[PDB]
Amino acid sequence: GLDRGLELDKVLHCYQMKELFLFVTWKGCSSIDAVPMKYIREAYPLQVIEFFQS
Amino acid sequence: LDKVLHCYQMKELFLFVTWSIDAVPMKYIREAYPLQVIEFFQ
Amino acid sequence: IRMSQKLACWQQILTTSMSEQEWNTFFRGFLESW
Amino acid sequence: AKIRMSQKLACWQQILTTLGTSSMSEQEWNTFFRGFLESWQ
C-alpha cells in the first residue's frame, strides 16, 4: 500500500501535474510516497498549508 | 471574498478566488482570510 | 467555468522560459486539473 | 535535498499508478517525467 494507515511524518516535496502530488514520509517508515494533494489535504489539512506557506 | 474555487502550484501555491476569477498566492489570501483558506484545504 | 477565464488565470500564474511543447503539455495538465 | 533515485522512481511509479498510463500519450508522459526529475533539482 501507499496510504498505509500511518501518521504523516513530513511533506518533503511537491510536483504539479493534472493532479498536485506531495512527496511525503510516514512515521517509522523510511520510504517516500507520492500522494495526491486532495487526499493528504483532507487528511492533514494543517501540515499541508504549513508546507506551502513556509 | 466569497469562494476559494481551486488551486495550482507553480512556484508558489495559488488559489483561484472570487469576490471575475483571480489567481493569487495562497499566502497572501491566507493572512487576510485564514478561515476560508483552512476550510478550502479541508 | 469559462475557458477564456481559466486561460486568463494560467497567464496570471505564468506572469508571476518553457518550450512550446512543454507549455502546451503543462497547460493541458493545468486544464484537466480543474 | 539528497534523495536517492530508487526513491524518486518509486514515486514516479506511484504517480503512474494513481493517474493510469492510459491517461496521457507517451510524449506527454515524457515531458512531465523530465519535469519531475528537474523538480528535485
Search chain C and give the residue with CA nearest B22: C9
* Unique residue bearing C-alpha cell 522560459: C17
Q: Which of D27, B22, B41, A26 is nearest to C11 (CA)?
A: B22
Tell me which residue has cell 518509486: D10
Contact B8 C8 (CB under 8 A): no
The DSSP letter of residue B11 is S
Strand partners for A14:
A22
- Within 8 A by CB and 6+ apart from C7, the residues are none
- Backbone dihedral region for residue B27 (phi beyond 0: left; psi -120 to 50: alpha; all else: beta): alpha
Describe chain C by its helix, strand, coil percentages, rounded to 5.
Answer: 80, 0, 20
The CB density around residue B12, as the number of other CB atoms within 10 Å, is 15
**Counting beta carbons within 10 angstroms of the beta carbon of residue B38, is it exposed (0 to 12), middle (13 to 18) or buried (19 or more)?**
middle
Taking CA atoms, D30 is separated from A37, B9, B19, B33, B37, in Å, by 22, 20, 39, 39, 34
CB-CB neighbors (< 8 A) of B16 in chain C: 9
Decide: helix, strand or coil at residue A18. coil
Is residue B24 within 8 Å of B15, Cβ to Cβ?
yes
Q: Is C34 on the interface with A (CB under 8 A)?
A: no
Cα–Cα dist A50/A37, whole Å: 13
* C34: closest CA of chain A, how far (Å): 8
Task: Please state whether at least 3 CB pairs lie below 8 Å between chains B and D.
Answer: no
Residues 6+ apart with CB under 8 A from D23: A18
Q: Resolution reached, in Å? A: 2.7
Q: Is D30 on the interface with A (CB under 8 A)?
A: no
- What is each CA distance from A33 to A14, A18, A39, B5, C28, in whole angstroms? 11, 18, 13, 27, 25
Chains A+C touching (3+ CB pairs under 8 Å):
yes
| Ramachandran category for residue D32: left, alpha or beta (phi over 0 → left; psi -120 to 50 → alpha) | alpha
Q: How far is C2 from chain A (nearest CA, A)?
A: 18
DSSP state of A32: E
Is B37 buried (19+), middle (13-18) or exposed (0-12) by CB count in 10 A? buried
